[PDB]
Amino acid sequence: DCERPCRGREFTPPLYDPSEIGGFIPDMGADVVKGFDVRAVIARLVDGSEFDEFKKLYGDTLVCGFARFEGMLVGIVANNGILYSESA
Amino acid sequence: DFKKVLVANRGEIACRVFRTCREMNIRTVAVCCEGEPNAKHVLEADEAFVLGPPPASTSYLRGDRIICAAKKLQADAVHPGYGFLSENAEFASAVLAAGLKFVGPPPAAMLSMGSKSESKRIMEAAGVPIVPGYYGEDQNPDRLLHEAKTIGFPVLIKAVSGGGGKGMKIVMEETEFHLMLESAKREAINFFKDDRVILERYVMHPRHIECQIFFDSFGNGVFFFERDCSVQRRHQKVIEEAPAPGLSVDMRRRIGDVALTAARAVGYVGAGTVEFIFDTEKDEFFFMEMNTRLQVEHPVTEQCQVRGRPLDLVRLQLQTAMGLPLGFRQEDISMSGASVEARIYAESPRNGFLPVGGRLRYLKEPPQGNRGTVKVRLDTGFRAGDDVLVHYDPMIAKLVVWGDNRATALEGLRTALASYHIVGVETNIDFLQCCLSNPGFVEGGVTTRFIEDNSVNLLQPREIPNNVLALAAVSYLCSQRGTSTLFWPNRQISQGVCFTVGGNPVVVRVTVSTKMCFTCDFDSSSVTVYVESTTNMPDSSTFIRVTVDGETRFGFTSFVTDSEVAVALPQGFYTLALQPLATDFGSTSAQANGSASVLSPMPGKVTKLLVADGTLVQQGQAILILEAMKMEHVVKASCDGEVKFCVHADGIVGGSTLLAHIASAA
Amino acid sequence: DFKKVLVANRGEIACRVFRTCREMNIRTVAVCCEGEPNAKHVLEADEAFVLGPPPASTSYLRGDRI
Numbered sequence: 001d002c003e004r005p006c007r008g009r010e011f012t013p014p015l016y017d018p019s020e021i022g023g024f025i026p027d028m029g030a031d032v033v034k035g036f037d038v039r040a041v042i043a044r045l046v047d048g049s050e051f052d053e054f055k056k057l058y059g060d061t062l063v064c065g066f067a068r069f070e071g072m073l074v075g076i077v078a079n080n081g082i083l084y085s086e087s088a
Numbered sequence: 089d090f091k092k093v094l095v096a097n098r099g100e101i102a103c104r105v106f107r108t109c110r111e112m113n114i115r116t117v118a119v120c121c122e123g124e125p126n127a128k129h130v131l132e133a134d135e136a137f138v139l140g141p142p143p144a145s146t147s148y149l150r151g152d153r154i155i156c157a158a159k160k161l162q163a164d165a166v167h168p169g170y171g172f173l174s175e176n177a178e179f180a181s182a183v184l185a186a187g188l189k190f191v192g193p194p195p196a197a198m199l200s201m202g203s204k205s206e207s208k209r210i211m212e213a214a215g216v217p218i219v220p221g222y223y224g225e226d227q228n229p230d231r232l233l234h235e236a237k238t239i240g241f242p243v244l245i246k247a248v249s250g251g252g253g254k255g256m257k258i259v260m261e262e263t264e265f266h267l268m269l270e271s272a273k274r275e276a277i278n279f280f281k282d283d284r285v286i287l288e289r290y291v292m293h294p295r296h297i298e299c300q301i302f303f304d305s306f307g308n309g310v311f312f313f314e315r316d317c318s319v320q321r322r323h324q325k326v327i328e329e330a331p332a333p334g335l336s337v338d339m340r341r342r343i344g345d346v347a348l349t350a351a352r353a354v355g356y357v358g359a360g361t362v363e364f365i366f367d368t369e370k371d372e373f374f375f376m377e378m379n380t381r382l383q384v385e386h387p388v389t390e391q392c393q394v395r396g397r398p399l400d401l402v403r404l405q406l407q408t409a410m411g412l413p414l415g416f417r418q419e420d421i422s423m424s425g426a427s428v429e430a431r432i433y434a435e436s437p438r439n440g441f442l443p444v445g446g447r448l449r450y451l452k453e454p455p456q457g458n459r460g461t462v463k464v465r466l467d468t469g470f471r472a473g474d475d476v477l478v479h480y481d482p483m484i485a486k487l488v489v490w491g492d493n494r495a496t497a498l499e500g501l502r503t504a505l506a507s508y509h510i511v512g513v514e515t516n517i518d519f520l521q522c523c524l525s526n527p528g529f530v531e532g533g534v535t536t537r538f539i540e541d542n543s544v545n546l547l548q549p550r551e552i553p554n555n556v557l558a559l560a561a562v563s564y565l566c567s568q569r570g571t572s573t574l575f576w577p578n579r580q581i582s583q584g585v586c587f588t589v590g591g592n593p594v595v596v597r598v599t600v601s602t603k604m605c606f607t608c609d610f611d612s613s614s615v616t617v618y619v620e621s622t623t624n625m626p627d628s629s630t631f632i633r634v635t636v637d638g639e640t641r642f643g644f645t646s647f648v649t650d651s652e653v654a655v656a657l658p659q660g661f662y663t664l665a666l667q668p669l670a671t672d673f674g675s676t677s678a679q680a681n682g683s684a685s686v687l688s689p690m691p692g693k694v695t696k697l698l699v700a701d702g703t704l705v706q707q708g709q710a711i712l713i714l715e716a717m718k719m720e721h722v723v724k725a726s727c728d729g730e731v732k733f734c735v736h737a738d739g740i741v742g743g744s745t746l747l748a749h750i751a752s753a754a
Numbered sequence: 755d756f757k758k759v760l761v762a763n764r765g766e767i768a769c770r771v772f773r774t775c776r777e778m779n780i781r782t783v784a785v786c787c788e789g790e791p792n793a794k795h796v797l798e799a800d801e802a803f804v805l806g807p808p809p810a811s812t813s814y815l816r817g818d819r820i
Contacts, residue, residue, distance in 0.1 A: 658781065
């Protein structure tokens, strides 16, 4: 049934409703595509909207951090603009 | 005979009606909005109907929606309680029109007694005593002086449109009248643009005395003695007593007869109340206002023995609504020992009695029932874990204690309030204890302004001895500790707990050994607490057995939240607020300079200034949009302050080009 | 009118006095020695005071300590 019987299901749902994620998503098909903060998406997907950012001031266009989905620890890498050498 | 009764008002009144319906085998139907997933009255009812959106204003007030709810659930009667929509004649008329039976007075009587003008005319025409005041159209100074002489000093002068106590002048002697009248007229003109004035008799020591009447559908009526509501602040009842102390039997008979006559004159059906302004010096009562509904203070009356059985006012109201004759007529009613009711609200008396919200994180109720010498009854609409929302039913609960004498009832109320442990919401338990222990209150009947008279004495701060601080710190540390052992080799483990006492950040430094012995340090003081054992109660609390110093053994109960620590010691109940956490912990808003001369990231075109020139912008706030490679890049403010742009919009910038200045405006 | 009554004797008599004081709303104070971590009267009382060493002879008999 399970290699380890540990459950670890003491998680908290996201603090923001996912139903408004589309509010932050601009029109991808456009002459000039607007930019948005991907963290607003992350806040509506992870447990308790908690997110430990890895290098908050270095990449600045690639958001890397730790989060949890129903108690499962996951590393999140998200695009937040043009990739640079520092972001890569 | 009713089979289903729908209660249109939430709160503890709904629970009371549900309980009395369960006693009478009537199915209960509740009313709620979409934002009430765990309301107590919803859980205590057989069925519930949602009224629509939850703004707490449209719901519980839509009469048509309530009628539809009652018709859909086959409700037989509609009981509005004493909350909102319980005094609207249109709602009662709609209830009667749909075929449902309204539990209350006829709509005509309810409408006639809500205007404050026609009600006075009816009361005058009935022979009921009225306040000896003059309100005629003649504003001639000589006529006003003659009317003041007829009324008898002292007198009070009010504006016709005056409200909130403005434009009222107290006249004690005839000489001062010529000046006070002119001053009142000037103030009325400056505030209401109406020089017309009203002269009434001023009562120096008023007492709001309420007589409760109950009338059948056949015209019979019976009074239910008296209720005293003198102890109040800004038209908010606080503490009530029954019967009113210092009232003779003849006076009570006279008041009851007057109340019955007034109710007969108005043609009342159901349970109603009449409030008079009684004067201790003059020993004469004058009609003030009648309420054509049940009242929150009705339990103190129920603690009246109809033919020996205790009174159930809601049961009688339901029986009358069904259309049944009264059992007896002022013969099987007997007075009993005095009962006292305290209204536990959710406000802070120290800070001007302003309502405050919160969540009832711990709600240990006092022992309710028939105690050794007194009977305790608690009525509440909240359970543990519920969150009380501010500006919506601020009353947390009402606690009534019945004894044989007023002193015994007061002692029982003090004991019950001492046992009412509430953690999560600020309350007025300390204020109620101060009021109960006040010598003036315990002497006997007091004036209405008593709260305003002893404000300095009643608002006295509660002292917190160092023992309470030490025990709270120890309880907090024990809550932090799990099964881990406290061990640092050749050292005592050091810990610190920060509380807020009167805005002062008090810090308790504790040294704990491996033998579970804490030593807490205060200014020139040391408290040693040895924790013998702990036990986690099912109500998220902990029972701790301690030995304070080396000679004071006792057990207590502790409740630890993320914001406060509560201890139930033999000395009483204490809640100490932890020092609040900063909201800007580790705040790095890309800069901290007062100028914030930011440079462009790359060559591009500035498209739009998202903030006007000279506008205040916070940290991380967008000020302009930069477009390069057909991609919108938004420049954000790095600090708070007024932003002034340097480059014009719809232009072009280069690498590391200055864009705007963020100057911290004073 | 009494508010606190201290019982100077352990055993079932202490429990009886504590019960009748709880009936009359009098706070109860108990007396014990250091060798009584789970004495019934200590648990049934609002407060307790240790009399000193536990030889069961000096304690419960020191009038000055009581």
